[PDB]
Write a protein that binds this ligand. Structure first.
Ligand SMILES: [Ca+2]
Ligand SMILES: [Ca+2]
Ligand SMILES: [Ca+2]
Length: 183
């Protein structure tokens, strides 16, 4: 199931939490004997259930919306992938972020899903001491890593996951230029 859901993460640039929330909603819109993770990811939700979606309530052309997001020309339904895109457009519970996705993968050296002290050390090391061309000392690197955890490691597990990473660089507009965190 982890590998299966992970595929969608690479396809949409959403966090695992976002995909999980969406998957639960998707399943609840399918037929009872369809909830099976691997089974559900192959099912399609009929427009009936999409039209009554809360985030589409105030939208005119709901019928049009369904047809545009639907990938299968034959059927009048949405696949899980189509559903993710719908939520990315109409719901605050799904916000694609291609920059966070790749930046995270770059610093997650062992590709294990989180940024630990070691991964974070390279991240903060992209910054400078004080002058325009400086390099951090051990203690400065330590403090910077400590500050990131203290401020963004909200599930207090000692690492930074994609969701938390998005918060770490949420105030760094030019982050991708040289991977510098603001402050
Ligand atoms: Ca959205
Ligand atoms: Ca890691
Ligand atoms: Ca964490």
């Amino acid at each position: 199931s982890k590998e299966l859901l992970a595929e969608y993460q690479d396809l949409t640039f959403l966090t695992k939490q976002e995909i999980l929330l969406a998957h639960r909603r998707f399943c609840e819109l399918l037929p009872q004997e369809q909830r099976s993770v691997e089974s559900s990811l192959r099912a399609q939700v009929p427009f009936e259930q999409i039209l009554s979606l809360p985030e589409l309530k105030a939208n005119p052309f709901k019928e049009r919306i369904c047809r545009v997001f639907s990938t299968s020309p034959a059927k009048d339904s949405l696949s899980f992938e189509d559903f993710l895109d719908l939520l990315s457009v109409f719901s605050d519970t799904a916000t694609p972020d291609i920059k966070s996705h790749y930046a995270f993968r770059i610093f997650d050296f062992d590709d294990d899903g989180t940024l630990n002290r070691e991964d974070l050390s390279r991240l903060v090391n992209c910054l400078t001491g004080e002058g325009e061309d400086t390099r951090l000392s051990a203690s400065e690197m330590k403090q910077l890593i400590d500050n990131i955890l203290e401020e963004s490691d909200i599930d207090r597990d000692g690492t930074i996951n994609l969701s938390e990473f998005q918060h770490v660089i949420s105030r760094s507009p030019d982050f991708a230029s040289s991977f510098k965190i603001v402050l």
